[model samples]
Target: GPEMVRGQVFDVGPRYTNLSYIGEGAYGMVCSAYDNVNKVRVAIKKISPFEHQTYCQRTLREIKILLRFRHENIIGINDIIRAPTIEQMKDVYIVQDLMETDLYKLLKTQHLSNDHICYFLYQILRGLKYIHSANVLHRDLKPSNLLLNTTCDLKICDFGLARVADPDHDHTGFLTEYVATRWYRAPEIMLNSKGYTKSIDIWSVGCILAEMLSNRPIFPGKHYLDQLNHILGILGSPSQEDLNCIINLKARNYLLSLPHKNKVPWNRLFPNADSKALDLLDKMLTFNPHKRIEVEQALAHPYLEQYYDPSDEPIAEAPFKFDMELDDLPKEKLKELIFEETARFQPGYR
Candidate 1:
């Protein structure tokens, strides 16, 4: 059964075989397989190709320009291939750099020291600073996506949920920060607001840092609604003006319906955490996503200053340009695009 299913999932090339199934989820199936021919080892990820057009788009994007965004703290694709079929899009395979474990996996097993926390947080932000500078938003930032090595190095992975940030749309995100008269602006982004900014990822970083400090998820909401509730419970109710920014009537009304609560003191929540670390964490977890700390500022914070390198923070040479039309394209078109990308990564290219 293993061999049969392995053939069904991979079915790529002789270069890689003996796939040992490692993990599987709604997104895709993953396995550890060796390039026995080249004496190489790697993790091979097989996509359903059509489970959703997003995967096809993601595979195409990563295979094409991942090298451009490459940094020590970010995961880079080593190779790309697709199993041929009548549909020609039956499945796509990606070869990724294998690492020891995920940060969350380590968190569940061993407690982290403050130095480790600072270093881990620094690496996450450094990679993120590069990503944000390229005008891309890593929307799915979390502990699990942060791949780790035995030496404590971390790489930000899983760009499937990442998207190109529209410069034209940065209008609303910066509204709160430039208020001439008020500390809080009237039109700041509310929870679950559409067209998220890079701050969404920063918010995730804050959640992750808190988890690391306490050795558990700070807001482990059972559901999205409950998740919002958990955040509101900790951060307290939004200001009346901030509440007005809610576009959807239900979301606006929901905030209005939420009971009043006071903000939880950072020292109280993460009692043993360094004051510097807690200060940074507080800004990252700011309720207003737009008002949350930016990646560049987070890197320069006192908590991470010991490890920060101004000259080392690199930005992409050019901004990532994602075509809006791709979001609505037919599955067949996305498949063709994915094929083109894999072609570019094949054995030889000119």
Candidate 2:
């Protein structure tokens, strides 16, 4: 049920009027509203906190991550509104700035010019530079997760799968198997390598750039194993040393048995792409995560130099700290956790 404010039921609050349904997902529904007080349109995501522990935890993590980020290329959280009282804590609302469309939808509409491509990719790298500098890995970075406006401004969104980079963290466990989507997933992740660094995001960026140029996915695989085959078909299988990095012996053995193939020429993959662009793309799509280009280095590449601004580089900061491990809590306890978090951010809003 939608929360009610001033005797009117709405997803967010009465301050945001003219509510219109936008989309629905596993988390909950999203609606666009006009903020009467701020005189701006905004997006409100109403998450059902009691539905499942994972959904509640994701909502909390997303809020915590967004609260720490303040960059033009990163999506900004406006406000988090909860029910007026604990008794009505059925739905938790997250309000954010509205964007015209996402990169995935825009790609389906029309082709982007080279200049447009450069600017968009520049913004993406700028955002990623900021995120990585903060010691955060956005595990999921794909076309649909990138929001854009009419002026070609791009902002990175959706941080549910993000995690703070901890050197001591053990990623060899069973939980890290699936992170990013299959098509944009990195080879290291595809091979189930446990020690994947921030380079995984860089690989996704490479796939996105290639898709932008070719107007199609660079690697479209039907399933997990098939995804590996697709990657091998294009980028070729990993070397012996690269295979050694995989902790999963079964996956490694399977990969070792596949026929060795040479990488496809960049010219043939993206014939219309300029030499400089192809050069950077080649470095980004490397099979070895260690060989993949870093976000900062990619930003400084000659291909993006035209759009590069030293000021756009992210300033190093202390790593973000938060308590996001609430997955084991029962439904009621999860609701209380989310409510407490929302109150901590926007006091007196309830």
Q: Pick the candidate with the highest TM-score.
A: 2
Off by over 4 Å in 2: 1-9, 170-176, 194-196, 323-333, 344-350
Candidate 1: the clashing residue pairs are none
Per-residue alpha-carbon lDDT of candidate 1 for residues 1-350, written as tens digits (9 for 90 to 100): 22324445466557787777777753678877888766877887777756667666665666555655778889988877764442665766778887878997999998999999999999999999989888887766778889998988899987765668763554442212220111111123333343447776787788888888998788765643566667777788887766765555655776777789888888998788899999998898876655778898899898988988879877778788765546678777877777665676666668
1-350: candidate 2 lDDT, tens digit per residue: 65534343565656777787777654667778988889998988777756677776677778778888898898988887776677777767778989889999999998888888888889999999999888888878999999998988899998877877654543453224674588988766655554337887898899999988988999998987677788888887687787787677766777778998888899898888878888999999988777789998999999998878877576546777665455476767767766776786455544
TM-score for each prediction?
0.86, 0.90
Give me the displacement of residue 93 in model 1, in angstroms. Answer: 1.0
Could you tally the backbone clashes for each prediction?
A: 0, 0
The TM-score obtained by model 2 is 0.90
For model 2, the local distance difference test gives 0.79
